[PDB]
Amino acid sequence: QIFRDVSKLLVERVDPKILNLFRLLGKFGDEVNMPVYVVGGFVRDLLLGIKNLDIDIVVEGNALEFAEYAKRFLPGKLVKHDKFMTASLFLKGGLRIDIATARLPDVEMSTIKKDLYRRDFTINAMAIKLNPKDFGLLIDFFGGYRDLKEGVIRVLHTLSFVDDPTRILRAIRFEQRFDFRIEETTERLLKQAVEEGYLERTTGPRLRQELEKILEEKNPLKSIRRMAQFDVIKHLFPKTYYTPSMDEKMENLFRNIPWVEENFGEVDRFYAVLHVFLEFYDDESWKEVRDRYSLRRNLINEIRHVEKSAPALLEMLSERVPASFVYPLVKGVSNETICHFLAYLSGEKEGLFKSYLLKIKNTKLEKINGEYLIRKGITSGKIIGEVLEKILMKKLDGDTRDEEEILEEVLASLETEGKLA
Amino acid sequence: MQIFRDVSKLLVERVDPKILNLFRLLGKFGDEVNMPVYVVGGFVRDLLLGIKNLDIDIVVEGNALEFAEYAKRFLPGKLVKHDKFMTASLFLKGGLRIDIATAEMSTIKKDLYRRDFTINAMAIKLNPKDFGLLIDFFGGYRDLKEGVIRVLHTLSFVDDPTRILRAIRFEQRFDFRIEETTERLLKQAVEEGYLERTTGPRLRQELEKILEEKNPLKSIRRMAQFDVIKHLFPKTYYTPSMDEKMENLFRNIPWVEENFGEVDRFYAVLHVFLEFYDDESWKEVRDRYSLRRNLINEIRHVEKSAPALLEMLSERVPASFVYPLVKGVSNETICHFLAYLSGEKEGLFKSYLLKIKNTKLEKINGEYLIRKGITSGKIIGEVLEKILMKKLDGDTRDEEEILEEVLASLETEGK
């Protein structure tokens, strides 16, 4: 079946506010005389019982016109994008109607079908018609309904990956999004495309997007693992080989990022995943990818920092060396560096190290001595700076005495180099 | 004989967006339950005339209850449903309210046919297929376009004699006139005594509305030609003298309202209307409608005082003389008096009313001064008044005045 009646569903599953907006939009359709459809995600999620609040409307006419007309009768702000004929209309409800012109009896579904044929995968290439006469009408040309029932992910034509290699990543993503499995042929096709080099033939920024989006989905580990299964990892970061070890690290990374988040703040997970993929990169191959995915410029140091002290950290964590020792390794590093370190850890090590950081931001207080104190009265710029990190570290397990401490370590300064006053 | 017409541009033209979306939605819902949906009556009329109208009365072919139920699942508000009549009312926010009632498919014909006039018997179909479709079976678009008041069939007035008053009401409302056949049909039903065949309430409501409307003087005068006055109140005969009083009655009602407050016009009309009524004549007229039991006396007061008041307006008597005539009387009665006055006399009587309304302060010295004075009883009121009179002729210290008063009141007779 190409066509199905889903009106019954609409009324059952759709917030009546939205449902009303759907009826209205369809009526404006009839008045201003243009075919009107919801498309894409909403149609998918509707059939899945998933709640979708984004609303893609496609019209067979002119989005701009359609939009202005619809705004006369709807409360809110209508943003126009004259370039490429689309409009985003934000209501009070805090939601947005997207309207866009269908690429160009009536032929109608030679044109909506052409719009739909342009999408990525079957489950996303469906439409429901809003025009009053055909209100319930589900328009599935490409077996995208069956494919929902079957949990299948499937491109629309052979060149789907050739046209937008970015779908290589997208398809992995929708597998984890809904426990869904890329079907036989599109898998063949996906693999052919990563083999021939279509990724490297897509832009850095578009790739970083869909990658950021994967790391935000369910079970990003599973997705990074599926990327490795298809060997896309390589074709994105050429010196990165997803070995059992990298994998072990990736598993550690993701298992800890949560803890890192609740305890330190926003962890940028695209940057954490990079703390692994990019390990032991060479100055040269670094640049390639830095100046290619627009990365921070200083990542190297933080990466190589952990890269180089990993086993040092590991040794300290063994024997349970007291706490002052590891401070220098962590000092003021990214949250995706804490993450990088944690990627080496599991069991006891991962815990004992956890404690360590918990103090380092925690019992880092250094409450009394301050900075204007110290004018008592040493005059240097870096002395005052050193003096303070010294006392801080005593404190990193020190018992008591906020001041009498800076008097016991000044004992280690007047001797040796220090001196003066 | 063009039944159909496309007022859809007009709907999006005049109608408020929020109400339009409501019309859109109502129609759509109709399709969803297989029910023809129309907005009908006065809104259609007013939209055609450019007159703002928030009434939204909807008719449907099917089941207004089922409809109003379905509608509510999507529309926010309160749903009262009058099961027996199969009517219903969606009470919406923004203080808006929508009534719903029930019945080829053009049975909306049989339903519109049973209304009063043609300009109120029109309908706009709401279903998205026919959305701005005006349906005028009876030439309401004609009569509307050309200021005509026409009844739908020859037995309207027989069916509802209250239409006699409404006909007149619409004339002064929109400035239209009753067309010839409907005139003859109304006069008829009036002589056939049909107007008299309707209950008190029904009639009185329409009467208050004719009066709430634009040209009451002309409305009443109009009811006169049609001989409807003599048929609502038996012993009231619309003489050229009754019209004299009406005219001054209505010329002064504004000034009364500006100076004393609201004015029940139904009553102010009854004053003039119900002059000279036998206790029996009044008792039946007060009983039919529900006039206050005391009004008949109030009508009497002015009725009798009139010549004396005129004598006093001429003769320019001191303000103390008029007071008894207007002492705690109703605004209606203050209107009744003014129904006798004009120009010269009128001006002064109003000038007196104002010195009675003010200059009634009785600054300090009231009722405690008297009681402590040693006086108890209903006499305390009589002396307070007798001070007020001297005062509404301008005077001295309230004390010097009570003293001159009581011991003036002492000579005549013992307090």
Side-chain angles (χ1 to χ4, degrees):
Chain A
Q1 288 177 78
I2 284 283
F3 295 113
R4 294 169 198 272
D5 169 2
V6 298
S7 51
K8 225 263 201 175
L9 261 85
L10 288 171
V11 306
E12 299 176 1
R13 311 191 187 193
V14 195
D15 177 350
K17 301 199 174 194
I18 275 44
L19 219 221
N20 269 358
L21 195 31
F22 281 160
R23 296 184 174 97
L24 281 199
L25 279 182
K27 222 306 195 167
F28 302 162
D30 280 18
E31 286 159 22
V32 92
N33 198 349
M34 317 166 185
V36 180
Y37 313 89
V38 266
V39 300
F42 177 96
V43 183
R44 176 192 68 219
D45 292 349
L46 175 84
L47 297 159
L48 289 183
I50 312 302
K51 148 160 179 154
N52 201 298
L53 230 60
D54 196 10
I55 56 198
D56 279 336
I57 277 32
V58 173
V59 303
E60 284 176 17
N62 180 0
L64 294 321
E65 285 172 20
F66 180 81
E68 295 208 288
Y69 181 68
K71 203 286 146 205
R72 273 209 265 160
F73 308 86
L74 300 158
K77 191 202 293 282
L78 175 65
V79 141
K80 269 175 159 195
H81 314 280
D82 264 83
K83 52 185 218 315
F84 55 65
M85 228 147 140
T86 70
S88 198
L89 180 34
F90 310 93
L91 289 328
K92 299 280 288 185
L95 80 192
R96 62 190 292 156
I97 323 270
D98 278 346
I99 328 87
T101 323
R103 214 200 63 104
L104 26 39
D106 208 301
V107 318
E108 316 192 328
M109 296 166 199
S110 153
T111 319
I112 190 46
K113 185 173 176 177
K114 273 189 185 279
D115 191 80
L116 265 22
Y117 209 85
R118 247 215 289 88
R119 312 253 157 180
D120 56 22
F121 321 108
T122 50
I123 55 163
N124 294 342
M126 273 170 311
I128 298 155
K129 200 178 177 187
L130 296 193
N131 309 277
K133 168 207 158 69
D134 303 303
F135 188 59
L137 194 77
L138 181 289
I139 300 160
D140 181 29
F141 290 118
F142 315 127
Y145 179 84
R146 165 210 57 195
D147 283 355
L148 271 188
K149 299 262 89 54
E150 287 166 8
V152 184
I153 285 179
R154 185 202 302 269
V155 294
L156 289 161
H157 59 282
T158 282
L159 304 158
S160 223
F161 293 110
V162 168
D163 295 332
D164 188 7
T166 231
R167 305 175 165 166
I168 291 173
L169 290 185
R170 286 173 72 83
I172 305 322
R173 203 173 82 239
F174 300 130
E175 288 193 320
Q176 320 318 324
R177 189 191 173 93
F178 336 96
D179 185 354
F180 270 25
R181 192 172 180 79
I182 293 167
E183 65 89 27
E184 189 171 8
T185 298
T186 90
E187 194 186 336
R188 227 196 68 241
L189 296 176
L190 193 159
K191 283 190 291 179
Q192 292 191 220
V194 3
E195 174 65 340
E196 290 153 341
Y198 282 87
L199 305 182
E200 20 272 284
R201 210 145 107 66
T202 93
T203 66
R206 293 195 70 192
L207 248 24
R208 172 172 184 164
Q209 192 183 326
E210 224 77 33
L211 223 90
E212 285 167 333
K213 285 212 200 96
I214 267 152
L215 306 174
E216 289 306 328
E217 255 299 340
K218 299 195 288 179
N219 217 314
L221 211 202
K222 188 160 180 179
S223 276
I224 284 152
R225 289 189 189 161
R226 182 125 247 214
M227 290 165 126
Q229 187 178 169
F230 296 142
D231 204 18
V232 334
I233 312 282
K234 200 201 301 179
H235 281 111
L236 294 184
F237 320 73
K239 267 44 188 159
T240 196
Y241 314 99
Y242 200 72
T243 73
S245 309
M246 174 153 297
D247 187 65
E248 178 167 316
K249 269 136 97 141
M250 206 54 96
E251 190 169 335
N252 287 336
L253 182 80
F254 288 110
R255 185 242 263 99
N256 271 292
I257 286 173
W259 178 102
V260 181
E261 276 184 319
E262 78 148 349
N263 269 291
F264 288 68
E266 256 316 64
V267 157
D268 183 7
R269 51 187 76 200
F270 175 52
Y271 265 63
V273 172
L274 282 185
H275 262 237
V276 195
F277 288 172
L278 264 33
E279 248 180 344
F280 304 101
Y281 260 54
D282 53 323
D283 294 23
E284 227 307 297
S285 279
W286 167 294
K287 167 196 175 191
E288 323 265 40
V289 99
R290 180 196 56 182
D291 310 347
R292 142 77 152 170
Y293 290 115
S294 313
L295 309 184
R296 212 156 275 170
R297 137 130 12 200
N298 196 236
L299 200 44
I300 149 210
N301 290 252
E302 13 213 15
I303 282 186
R304 310 193 180 182
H305 171 58
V306 209
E307 193 177 281
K308 300 174 191 203
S309 64
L313 216 212
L314 269 163
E315 306 191 291
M316 286 159 218
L317 300 168
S318 165
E319 266 153 11
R320 308 187 180 180
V321 86
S324 324
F325 318 60
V326 30
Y327 175 103
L329 307 176
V330 303
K331 185 141 179 165
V333 288
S334 28
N335 285 151
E336 43 282 349
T337 279
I338 329 264
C339 281
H340 192 332
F341 269 99
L342 271 157
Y344 286 80
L345 303 329
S346 95
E348 296 204 9
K349 316 267 181 179
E350 107 143 15
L352 268 205
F353 178 61
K354 267 182 195 167
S355 120
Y356 281 17
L357 317 113
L358 249 41
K359 181 180 180 180
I360 287 193
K361 83 147 188 172
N362 217 218
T363 83
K364 68 163 179 174
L365 55 243
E366 211 62 312
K367 285 190 142 194
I368 208 271
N369 180 297
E371 199 157 312
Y372 199 76
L373 198 175
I374 240 306
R375 265 22 208 311
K376 170 223 154 183
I378 52 195
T379 157
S380 169
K382 49 175 163 195
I383 287 307
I384 143 75
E386 299 164 7
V387 165
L388 266 52
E389 194 151 85
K390 325 269 207 177
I391 43 194
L392 187 57
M393 231 96 313
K394 323 295 307 190
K395 179 60 180 180
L396 258 185
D397 34 342
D399 202 297
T400 326
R401 313 285 132 256
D402 299 343
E403 173 100 28
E404 105 188 20
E405 162 184 344
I406 178 260
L407 214 67
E408 255 65 68
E409 266 283 17
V410 86
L411 173 156
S413 272
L414 281 184
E415 169 57 31
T416 320
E417 150 83 40
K419 198 190 178 184
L420 286 58
Chain B
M1 196 264 159
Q2 185 182 138
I3 306 180
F4 308 104
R5 205 174 313 248
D6 170 304
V7 307
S8 41
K9 264 277 205 65
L10 204 48
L11 288 173
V12 33
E13 152 81 352
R14 277 100 134 88
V15 191
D16 205 72
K18 205 192 180 71
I19 289 66
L20 246 186
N21 294 164
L22 228 190
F23 284 135
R24 270 148 179 161
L25 281 190
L26 283 182
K28 222 322 198 134
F29 298 156
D31 285 344
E32 305 178 3
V33 302
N34 184 216
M35 278 179 26
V37 186
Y38 323 81
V39 55
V40 296
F43 175 86
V44 188
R45 186 203 69 217
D46 278 344
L47 158 82
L48 288 179
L49 301 174
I51 278 309
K52 178 161 182 162
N53 175 346
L54 268 166
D55 283 15
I56 143 192
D57 171 21
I58 274 65
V59 176
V60 296
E61 303 193 35
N63 191 312
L65 297 176
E66 280 174 38
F67 184 80
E69 205 104 58
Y70 190 75
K72 185 70 214 323
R73 302 172 51 187
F74 310 106
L75 271 14
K78 204 168 193 174
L79 174 76
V80 179
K81 29 162 57 204
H82 332 309
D83 282 48
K84 204 171 186 196
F85 321 75
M86 287 204 217
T87 311
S89 302
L90 219 321
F91 279 98
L92 302 166
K93 310 187 177 188
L96 204 53
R97 181 264 273 257
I98 91 212
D99 319 301
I100 314 169
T102 311
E104 321 162 12
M105 115 215 67
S106 285
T107 327
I108 188 59
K109 195 201 172 182
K110 181 183 171 173
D111 187 82
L112 301 191
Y113 198 46
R114 56 170 180 73
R115 319 213 167 211
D116 48 350
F117 310 111
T118 76
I119 54 142
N120 295 328
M122 290 184 294
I124 306 180
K125 181 163 208 177
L126 289 192
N127 309 263
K129 186 185 205 212
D130 299 346
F131 179 73
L133 173 77
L134 213 219
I135 303 170
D136 185 22
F137 289 128
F138 316 111
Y141 189 85
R142 178 193 40 181
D143 300 338
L144 193 288
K145 186 204 165 179
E146 62 186 54
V148 178
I149 307 290
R150 179 205 318 282
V151 117
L152 301 205
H153 66 294
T154 71
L155 268 67
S156 335
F157 299 119
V158 184
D159 283 25
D160 179 352
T162 223
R163 283 157 187 187
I164 296 160
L165 289 180
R166 272 191 282 159
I168 298 167
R169 193 176 107 236
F170 290 132
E171 296 195 336
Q172 330 307 342
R173 165 80 172 265
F174 307 112
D175 275 336
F176 302 171
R177 83 295 188 158
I178 288 158
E179 69 88 4
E180 186 165 14
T181 311
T182 35
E183 191 154 343
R184 141 177 150 155
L185 208 298
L186 176 158
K187 289 176 185 192
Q188 174 152 354
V190 157
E191 322 299 358
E192 320 267 331
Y194 274 104
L195 183 146
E196 325 203 342
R197 205 148 161 164
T198 318
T199 87
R202 279 86 158 184
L203 275 317
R204 187 215 174 120
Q205 209 197 191
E206 275 310 318
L207 216 24
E208 275 160 338
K209 280 174 193 189
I210 292 175
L211 299 183
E212 276 178 13
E213 187 69 64
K214 193 189 162 83
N215 217 261
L217 217 195
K218 179 170 176 168
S219 275
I220 293 167
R221 287 179 191 178
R222 183 104 230 198
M223 308 182 64
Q225 323 177 48
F226 300 125
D227 194 49
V228 326
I229 323 254
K230 308 164 69 195
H231 281 269
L232 292 153
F233 319 115
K235 287 90 173 192
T236 190
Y237 304 98
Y238 204 79
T239 87
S241 267
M242 200 152 302
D243 198 280
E244 304 279 5
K245 303 182 186 190
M246 273 315 184
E247 149 141 36
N248 319 160
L249 176 56
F250 278 116
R251 162 171 44 108
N252 283 287
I253 280 169
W255 179 98
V256 167
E257 270 166 358
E258 292 167 329
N259 288 99
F260 294 104
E262 219 202 60
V263 169
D264 185 290
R265 325 210 159 169
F266 180 39
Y267 266 62
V269 170
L270 287 160
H271 271 222
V272 183
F273 265 11
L274 290 188
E275 271 183 346
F276 320 138
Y277 264 68
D278 314 82
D279 284 324
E280 284 302 345
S281 288
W282 147 256
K283 190 159 279 212
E284 69 193 11
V285 154
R286 95 150 177 281
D287 277 320
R288 181 97 174 303
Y289 317 133
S290 296
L291 305 318
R292 295 167 46 262
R293 208 164 170 166
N294 340 242
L295 164 81
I296 185 51
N297 294 315
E298 319 203 20
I299 314 194
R300 319 269 214 200
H301 179 100
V302 277
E303 192 181 45
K304 296 165 185 172
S305 307
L309 194 267
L310 302 172
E311 284 186 38
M312 297 168 52
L313 282 181
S314 178
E315 187 165 301
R316 200 142 179 156
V317 303
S320 43
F321 263 76
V322 266
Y323 178 101
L325 295 79
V326 302
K327 167 174 174 180
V329 295
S330 82
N331 298 33
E332 300 54 64
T333 81
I334 290 197
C335 282
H336 201 335
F337 274 118
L338 278 167
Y340 282 100
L341 279 29
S342 160
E344 272 263 306
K345 294 74 184 53
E346 159 198 301
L348 269 272
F349 184 101
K350 276 151 86 180
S351 173
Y352 272 25
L353 252 31
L354 264 290
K355 195 168 182 185
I356 309 293
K357 180 211 158 153
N358 318 314
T359 274
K360 214 174 154 184
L361 60 177
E362 191 81 284
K363 323 141 39 37
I364 94 66
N365 141 295
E367 60 180 1
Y368 234 76
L369 221 125
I370 287 293
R371 190 196 205 170
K372 272 178 152 185
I374 182 182
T375 135
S376 327
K378 310 72 213 199
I379 79 102
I380 75 171
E382 170 163 342
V383 324
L384 285 167
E385 171 152 306
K386 279 196 190 317
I387 306 282
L388 193 53
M389 312 306 259
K390 222 44 211 155
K391 208 163 192 68
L392 63 60
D393 310 348
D395 230 17
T396 336
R397 212 311 144 267
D398 295 60
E399 185 59 38
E400 187 179 323
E401 181 138 335
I402 173 194
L403 289 187
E404 184 196 328
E405 213 296 55
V406 294
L407 266 74
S409 205
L410 152 147
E411 213 179 39
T412 297
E413 289 301 6
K415 155 274 165 180

